[PDB]
Write a protein that binds this ligand. Structure first.
Ligand code: 40S
Length: 180
């Protein structure tokens, strides 16, 4: 996509949980299941505002635990998240370090979602005792996402992806150039 970001409607991803998503990189939180996405897919860099992932909805399905590779199930449920946040390359090399020089992370995945714990997504998705998974994602209509958006936290905040056709397409737009 514009900026050299890698933004595909479907693919393979790794998954982790995180806490504290009330002031996320898109500049609006959402009261429903949400995630951060790795920088190369987010479409912006820290401090440059919303990227084109902002507001888009994705169905996430886990089917492997890379840290418990002998585990065959049960996995959690498929969940639909709205992307509100950025997982920067800096400080997140293992899961979010995809760049234009090396477009997969340490688990071989070209995308990563950090599912926010606060609003319940992680408890639905991760079986008890598992904090990292790999699997698939598919961008879906936000008709499949439940909840309401939060208020704008700063000028330029954007969740416009929530009404966009799937990638490739443009809603909030990408900022700057993808990490290398
Ligand atoms: C998704 C990140 C948000 C703060 O940079 C946290 C990853 O643990």
């Amino acid at each position: 996509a514009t900026g050299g970001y890698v933004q595909q409607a479907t693919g393979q991803a790794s998954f982790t949980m995180y806490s504290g998503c009330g002031s996320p990189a898109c500049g609006k939180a959402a009261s429903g299941f949400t995630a951060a996405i790795n920088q190369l897919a987010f479409g912006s860099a820290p401090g440059l505002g919303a990227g084109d992932a902002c507001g888009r909805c994705f169905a996430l399905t886990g089917n492997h635990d890379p840290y418990s590779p002998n585990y065959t199930g049960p996995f959690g449920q498929t969940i639909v998240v709205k992307v509100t946040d950025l997982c920067p390359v800096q400080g997140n090399q293992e899961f979010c370090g995809q760049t234009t020089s090396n477009p997969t992370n340490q688990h071989g995945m070209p995308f990563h979602f950090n599912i926010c714990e606060d609003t319940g997504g992680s408890a639905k998705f991760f079986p008890s005792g598992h904090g990292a998974l790999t699997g698939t994602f598919t961008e879906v209509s936000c008709s499949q996402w439940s909840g309401s958006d939060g208020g704008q936290l700063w000028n330029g905040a954007c969740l416009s992806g929530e009404t966009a056709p799937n990638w490739p397409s443009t809603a909030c737009g990408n900022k700057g150039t993808a990490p290398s």
